[PDB]
Amino acid sequence: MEISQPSIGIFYISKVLALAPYATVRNSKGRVEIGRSWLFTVYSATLTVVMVFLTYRGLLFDANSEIPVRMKSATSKVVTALDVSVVVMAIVSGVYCGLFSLNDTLELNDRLNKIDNTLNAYNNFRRDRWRALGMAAVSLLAISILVGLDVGTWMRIAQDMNIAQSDTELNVHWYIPFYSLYFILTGLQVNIANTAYGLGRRFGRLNRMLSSSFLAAAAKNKGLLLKSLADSHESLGKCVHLLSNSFGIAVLFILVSCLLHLVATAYFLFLELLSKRDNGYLWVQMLWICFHFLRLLMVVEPCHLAARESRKTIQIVCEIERKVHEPILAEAVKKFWQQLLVVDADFSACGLCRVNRTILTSFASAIATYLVALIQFQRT
Amino acid sequence: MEISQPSIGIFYISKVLALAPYATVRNSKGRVEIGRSWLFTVYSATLTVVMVFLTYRGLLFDANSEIPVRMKSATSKVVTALDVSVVVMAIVSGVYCGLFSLNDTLELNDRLNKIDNTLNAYNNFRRDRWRALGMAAVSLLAISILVGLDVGTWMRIAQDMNIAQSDTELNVHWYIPFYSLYFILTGLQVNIANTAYGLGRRFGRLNRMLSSSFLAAAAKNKGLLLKSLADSHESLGKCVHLLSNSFGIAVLFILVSCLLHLVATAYFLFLELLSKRDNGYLWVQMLWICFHFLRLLMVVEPCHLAARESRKTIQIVCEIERKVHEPILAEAVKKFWQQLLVVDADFSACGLCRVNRTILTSFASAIATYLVALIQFQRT
Amino acid sequence: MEISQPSIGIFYISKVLALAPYATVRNSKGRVEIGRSWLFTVYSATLTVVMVFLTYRGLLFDANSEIPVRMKSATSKVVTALDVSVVVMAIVSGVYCGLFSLNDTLELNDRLNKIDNTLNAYNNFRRDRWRALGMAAVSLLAISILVGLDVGTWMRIAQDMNIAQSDTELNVHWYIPFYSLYFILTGLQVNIANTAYGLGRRFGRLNRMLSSSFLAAAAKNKGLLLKSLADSHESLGKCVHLLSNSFGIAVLFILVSCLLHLVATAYFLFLELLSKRDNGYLWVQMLWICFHFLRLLMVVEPCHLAARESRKTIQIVCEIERKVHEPILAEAVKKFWQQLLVVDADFSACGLCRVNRTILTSFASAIATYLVALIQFQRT
Amino acid sequence: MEISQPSIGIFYISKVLALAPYATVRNSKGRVEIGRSWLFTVYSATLTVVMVFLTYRGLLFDANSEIPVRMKSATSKVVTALDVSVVVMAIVSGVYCGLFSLNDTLELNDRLNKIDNTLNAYNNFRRDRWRALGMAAVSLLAISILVGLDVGTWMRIAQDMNIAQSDTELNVHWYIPFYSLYFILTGLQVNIANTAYGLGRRFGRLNRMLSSSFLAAAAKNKGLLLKSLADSHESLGKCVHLLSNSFGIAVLFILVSCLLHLVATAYFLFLELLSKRDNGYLWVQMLWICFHFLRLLMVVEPCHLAARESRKTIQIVCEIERKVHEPILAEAVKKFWQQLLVVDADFSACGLCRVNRTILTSFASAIATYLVALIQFQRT
């Protein structure tokens, strides 16, 4: 997990959302030290347990209410329970990752500090800060707007089904912890995306530096510069492995949540389209499909970008080999090419799957198969 | 995207079909310069928007007509809407690719000019021109014939269902923009196939030159020739990457269109075969299956051929290593083998999938699964 | 396609079955020359066309008879037509491969002669001849027995359904060309399996020779021996590619036939088990499942064995590197290791799929999916 | 198969469970010699045949009883028969593997003795013994508890359905051989997991030794130490191949058993949940799901761990290359890197599939697909 000064806003958002239980004090040199915050550690554990219990308490209350709002039919009960369960597993995995990844966070940030020093010619504090804040603001605004629309639509649905001998508005009011869990999930995805995007961006900066220093006395300094670039590439690969080892189960549960959410929400959209009972509900479900697809991209694209940027470095080095003539420089380029021969670039979610754009194709095939099967389920 | 003098006819076809908004003036040396044509740029954007709007306007008109011809049943409505949607996405992606790939087109054609100069012993202007014109003519003739047959069959179907209190012929007449979109899709596929086939053909010419110059004073010239061949192979690989980066989303949407078209048309053929209501409709649907399979091959085969031709070069170089004895020549062959160790050969459609003949197996499995599921859908 | 003196019996079986239209005259040196036999070329083409036409004529006759025996229900009609179609495509592809693979056959046999000369210490004429004749005899005996059982069972079924106003025995008698096509398919599979098994066996002999000559004046001869082994390995890989290029579509259609046959026969076995109408039919269908699984193994196992044997050579060479000290010998082993780094070992069926034991897992998954879907089809 | 002094308890458990028919006498040096035990060889074969026959005899008795307990409905009959069949195939494959893997067991233990001598600094007799005994005790306790719960639940179900004119308790009493087969399966899985975990643990110890001796006169000894580490890594890879060649079909049938068990038990849990007839049965089925998932992990995780540990050695060696300067030491590290370039690390179950955590994803997808299809089967 990355905590830098440009992206300190994302870290604060994750910290208040029980995902980054670390206390950071900025040094006079601009470097950010990281240490365990036991106050926020117990706060994160307590908040996760309490709000997960509250979310399931509201689920049971809706199921045991006089007039259920969401847990009405057996199919609706199973779909709603699964919808809550995937969010709960994703946020719990994210909090667990944040609690037990302090050492890997320290190693990742130390390596990133060294890499940033190496690539100081391509650092942009303003652009990085605005990109990080923009991504966090857009994600939080999107989830806030969709939560407001969803709660309003469900409040209207509850009012329509309301009977004078029971209250249905409180049933919608008891789903507030579920939407707060959605906020925690959004913060966790923003934090993971920020770290993975930073790794891919630094890989791209390394490739740009290689091409700008080797394809567009002095030879000793140039060889030292190439040695620094090779060390930075190896360190960036280790950083990718650190992020995978720390948040692999979180990414895996995010992917599972995205798959189940897309299938279930599309199935509900088909049911409402067949019934044609409400139009605003259809638009809200379409927005939910967009949100789930966007967060799937937000977890998939950064890993694919990092892998691609890290895998084109060997082609750049091959060109450098075809262009180098100096003995010590050619030996250094040979060492770099040998290192790049066996680099493990792809992001792995605990070894279950490799996180790249191929996951999108697998997700699309699985969504189509399960959706069609559910249609046959409904007709029968 | 390739624009050469032998294949200038395909470029003109793509230009009038809103896919190649580039102005090319032939030099006195025979080289074709390429520049943005703002007249054809705005023409391509305007034509795409206008005819897409007209196609969907005709779709809505058919759905809102007194007697619908194609949008009759809910299953028919969904299938017809999806049939129009995949064509619209494919042609829009192709036009978008053609609008924002001028720089990559310039780089690809510059590299191809250098490669053609290197392999001038294997260039055949007459054969290349006739192959390109033949492929374009066959594709345009096939789509023209199938459009005429489809509109005639649908006109007959509309006449059979016609009632004196409504007009059904105009419903078929409003599907003309959809068939024009089919023409644009055919032109886009011809352009992509021409570029990819040219890359694979040049890879094969490079392999032939390697085998004819190294397996069947002077040594310095021979080593320079091998250096040119190695540079040509690297440039051809970069050309494949340029084509993938420029038209990857177009190829991906073409593949999606082919998959959906094959599944939907086969499902309609099964429905008509079960009903046994019309025989000419069955033959037209069979021709549509042939056309969709042929265009799937036309987008899949060139990429597979390019990958295979580029991947056998390393075996040829290994034989050259086993046959070479000259010091400078052996060093050059060693450099070539090292370069060929890490070549990225497969064509990638935005990283979603690798375009080769394995896609055919995946398509066949997916088609069988979805088709059988649709049969169970219809029986229920 | 391999035609050697030990396996000349398999070649004669394939020749009389319209699969090997080659005229071979044995030399005084024991080498078998191969040339096109226009008499057997036109015989193969004529026999294939005639018996394919007869098989489909009998299919149409059964469908148009007063009391159909196999083409009774629409589901039965589709299953029986597909059962005939896969056999027809497989045998036609095999005959087409045999007609247009004379040059590759010549190259493969020339390479195999050189390899056999290199590995003459491990050649066993008696064992190879008895293995080839045993495989051919077992396959022909199995298909003969199953054809007799199938025709007897169908004759009994026709007699049970017989009505005095029609003849049903002639309906079974018109399926004789279909069973002859099964014989041609068995011969084609035997020929392909013999060639692929020979390639894998020679790979294993090469590995044994490497381990027995390098792991268990003189150094110059030993280096020459290693050069011969490296050339033999490269030639064996080219032989695998020759077999793939010649009979890839035949192997692909054999795999398609095996998949469709297993699914359809298992579905019919489930139908008969549900009906419990006949027990001998159930046993015959179980034998057909065994036969289709065995021929699937007969086409899959040899390719997997060849790939495994060719892929363990690099490990043997790595051990030789760790054991070699002589300068020229170490250089030769380095060249061999470099060659083995980039060997294309897996058998490819026209690039559609890689033929190994992974195909068995894919087949099992596909069979389970389609079978379960067909069960839901039948219940509905 | 591994038989060491720390893990001698697992060997004894496997020996009394007809899985390790080997007689071992401990030497005065602490080394364990292994030889065929014909008494236990015939005991293993006789016990396997007898109890398999008894399990199927009880299955037939339940099917032919007046009031069947488990083989009541046709769906129940098929599910129960498949449940018994997968266990029978798994235990039979395990016994067959144990009977015909004496030579590979000898080779594996000789190699492991050499590796343990090489890595004697990281051997922990107490920790290894307690880990092996703990894993065996936990697995046996879990299967014992679940067998007791399952037999008690089925006894209660039989008592509820009991009619005065028949006995149903004996029907449950005749399923005792099936539960004994479950015990044999648990012992076989413990033995396989112990061997695979030992291989992965030794790979990790080798990586730790490499990092502690090369990253944290004398140079000759250090080079000899690296040569020993390289030999140990190659020997560990050969040990993984020995385990795969010996117990590949056993692992494959264990995977098939796990897949079928998870699908069938989940389907029965869904049926009972829909019926809501018994709650204790639901809890027992949930425990069975946990047990099948845990044994799937117990067969999948060790292979994935071994592959990962063996695949990070090349990265460690790359760092050593970047840190080494001594000529003979650098040459030794170059040899080690060359060896690690082409290491076959993944565990293969007879080539059908590669055993790693990707199997979990494939299993999850297959389970979801078959389960949903079975739900549609039940509703229809």
mmCIF file with all atom_site columns, C-alpha atoms in Angstrom, chain C residues 137-192:
data_model
loop_
_atom_site.group_PDB
_atom_site.id
_atom_site.type_symbol
_atom_site.label_atom_id
_atom_site.label_alt_id
_atom_site.label_comp_id
_atom_site.label_asym_id
_atom_site.label_entity_id
_atom_site.label_seq_id
_atom_site.pdbx_PDB_ins_code
_atom_site.Cartn_x
_atom_site.Cartn_y
_atom_site.Cartn_z
_atom_site.occupancy
_atom_site.B_iso_or_equiv
_atom_site.pdbx_formal_charge
_atom_site.auth_seq_id
_atom_site.auth_comp_id
_atom_site.auth_asym_id
_atom_site.auth_atom_id
_atom_site.pdbx_PDB_model_num
ATOM 1  C CA . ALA C 1 137 ? -5.159  -55.873 -35.712 1.00 0.00 ? 137 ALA C CA 1
ATOM 2  C CA . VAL C 1 138 ? -6.677  -54.834 -32.372 1.00 0.00 ? 138 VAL C CA 1
ATOM 3  C CA . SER C 1 139 ? -8.255  -51.698 -33.850 1.00 0.00 ? 139 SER C CA 1
ATOM 4  C CA . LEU C 1 140 ? -9.671  -53.546 -36.866 1.00 0.00 ? 140 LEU C CA 1
ATOM 5  C CA . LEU C 1 141 ? -10.922 -56.420 -34.698 1.00 0.00 ? 141 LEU C CA 1
ATOM 6  C CA . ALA C 1 142 ? -12.589 -53.988 -32.284 1.00 0.00 ? 142 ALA C CA 1
ATOM 7  C CA . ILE C 1 143 ? -14.347 -52.047 -35.042 1.00 0.00 ? 143 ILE C CA 1
ATOM 8  C CA . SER C 1 144 ? -15.359 -55.282 -36.798 1.00 0.00 ? 144 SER C CA 1
ATOM 9  C CA . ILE C 1 145 ? -16.841 -56.738 -33.606 1.00 0.00 ? 145 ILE C CA 1
ATOM 10 C CA . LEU C 1 146 ? -18.664 -53.513 -32.752 1.00 0.00 ? 146 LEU C CA 1
ATOM 11 C CA . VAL C 1 147 ? -20.017 -53.192 -36.298 1.00 0.00 ? 147 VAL C CA 1
ATOM 12 C CA . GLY C 1 148 ? -21.351 -56.749 -36.107 1.00 0.00 ? 148 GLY C CA 1
ATOM 13 C CA . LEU C 1 149 ? -22.910 -56.123 -32.700 1.00 0.00 ? 149 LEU C CA 1
ATOM 14 C CA . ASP C 1 150 ? -24.394 -52.797 -33.815 1.00 0.00 ? 150 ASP C CA 1
ATOM 15 C CA . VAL C 1 151 ? -25.909 -54.221 -37.000 1.00 0.00 ? 151 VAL C CA 1
ATOM 16 C CA . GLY C 1 152 ? -27.295 -57.205 -35.085 1.00 0.00 ? 152 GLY C CA 1
ATOM 17 C CA . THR C 1 153 ? -28.830 -55.002 -32.393 1.00 0.00 ? 153 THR C CA 1
ATOM 18 C CA . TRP C 1 154 ? -30.369 -52.684 -34.989 1.00 0.00 ? 154 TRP C CA 1
ATOM 19 C CA . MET C 1 155 ? -31.664 -55.693 -36.938 1.00 0.00 ? 155 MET C CA 1
ATOM 20 C CA . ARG C 1 156 ? -33.374 -56.928 -33.767 1.00 0.00 ? 156 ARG C CA 1
ATOM 21 C CA . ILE C 1 157 ? -34.807 -53.452 -33.126 1.00 0.00 ? 157 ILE C CA 1
ATOM 22 C CA . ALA C 1 158 ? -36.112 -53.321 -36.705 1.00 0.00 ? 158 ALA C CA 1
ATOM 23 C CA . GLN C 1 159 ? -37.692 -56.775 -36.351 1.00 0.00 ? 159 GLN C CA 1
ATOM 24 C CA . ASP C 1 160 ? -39.436 -55.708 -33.134 1.00 0.00 ? 160 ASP C CA 1
ATOM 25 C CA . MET C 1 161 ? -40.912 -52.611 -34.815 1.00 0.00 ? 161 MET C CA 1
ATOM 26 C CA . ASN C 1 162 ? -41.633 -54.462 -38.078 1.00 0.00 ? 162 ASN C CA 1
ATOM 27 C CA . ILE C 1 163 ? -45.152 -54.230 -39.515 1.00 0.00 ? 163 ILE C CA 1
ATOM 28 C CA . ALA C 1 164 ? -46.454 -56.639 -42.146 1.00 0.00 ? 164 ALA C CA 1
ATOM 29 C CA . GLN C 1 165 ? -47.133 -53.730 -44.541 1.00 0.00 ? 165 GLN C CA 1
ATOM 30 C CA . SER C 1 166 ? -43.476 -52.623 -44.714 1.00 0.00 ? 166 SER C CA 1
ATOM 31 C CA . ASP C 1 167 ? -39.889 -53.890 -44.574 1.00 0.00 ? 167 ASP C CA 1
ATOM 32 C CA . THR C 1 168 ? -37.524 -52.628 -41.869 1.00 0.00 ? 168 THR C CA 1
ATOM 33 C CA . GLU C 1 169 ? -34.581 -55.008 -42.384 1.00 0.00 ? 169 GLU C CA 1
ATOM 34 C CA . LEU C 1 170 ? -33.584 -53.224 -45.599 1.00 0.00 ? 170 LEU C CA 1
ATOM 35 C CA . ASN C 1 171 ? -33.373 -50.005 -43.571 1.00 0.00 ? 171 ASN C CA 1
ATOM 36 C CA . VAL C 1 172 ? -30.607 -51.576 -41.478 1.00 0.00 ? 172 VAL C CA 1
ATOM 37 C CA . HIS C 1 173 ? -29.045 -53.086 -44.619 1.00 0.00 ? 173 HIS C CA 1
ATOM 38 C CA . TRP C 1 174 ? -28.709 -49.582 -46.103 1.00 0.00 ? 174 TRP C CA 1
ATOM 39 C CA . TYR C 1 175 ? -26.427 -48.504 -43.223 1.00 0.00 ? 175 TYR C CA 1
ATOM 40 C CA . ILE C 1 176 ? -23.603 -50.800 -44.414 1.00 0.00 ? 176 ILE C CA 1
ATOM 41 C CA . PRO C 1 177 ? -21.777 -47.894 -46.151 1.00 0.00 ? 177 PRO C CA 1
ATOM 42 C CA . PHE C 1 178 ? -21.818 -46.011 -42.841 1.00 0.00 ? 178 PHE C CA 1
ATOM 43 C CA . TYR C 1 179 ? -20.044 -48.914 -41.126 1.00 0.00 ? 179 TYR C CA 1
ATOM 44 C CA . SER C 1 180 ? -17.550 -49.093 -43.995 1.00 0.00 ? 180 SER C CA 1
ATOM 45 C CA . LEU C 1 181 ? -16.865 -45.412 -43.337 1.00 0.00 ? 181 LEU C CA 1
ATOM 46 C CA . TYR C 1 182 ? -16.216 -46.442 -39.736 1.00 0.00 ? 182 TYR C CA 1
ATOM 47 C CA . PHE C 1 183 ? -13.639 -48.915 -41.064 1.00 0.00 ? 183 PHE C CA 1
ATOM 48 C CA . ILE C 1 184 ? -11.973 -46.152 -43.094 1.00 0.00 ? 184 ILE C CA 1
ATOM 49 C CA . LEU C 1 185 ? -11.951 -43.920 -40.007 1.00 0.00 ? 185 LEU C CA 1
ATOM 50 C CA . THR C 1 186 ? -10.339 -46.712 -37.979 1.00 0.00 ? 186 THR C CA 1
ATOM 51 C CA . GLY C 1 187 ? -7.643  -47.152 -40.622 1.00 0.00 ? 187 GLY C CA 1
ATOM 52 C CA . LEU C 1 188 ? -6.986  -43.408 -40.742 1.00 0.00 ? 188 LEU C CA 1
ATOM 53 C CA . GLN C 1 189 ? -6.676  -43.251 -36.954 1.00 0.00 ? 189 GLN C CA 1
ATOM 54 C CA . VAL C 1 190 ? -4.336  -46.260 -36.974 1.00 0.00 ? 190 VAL C CA 1
ATOM 55 C CA . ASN C 1 191 ? -2.120  -44.597 -39.590 1.00 0.00 ? 191 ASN C CA 1
ATOM 56 C CA . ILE C 1 192 ? -1.991  -41.283 -37.710 1.00 0.00 ? 192 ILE C CA 1
#
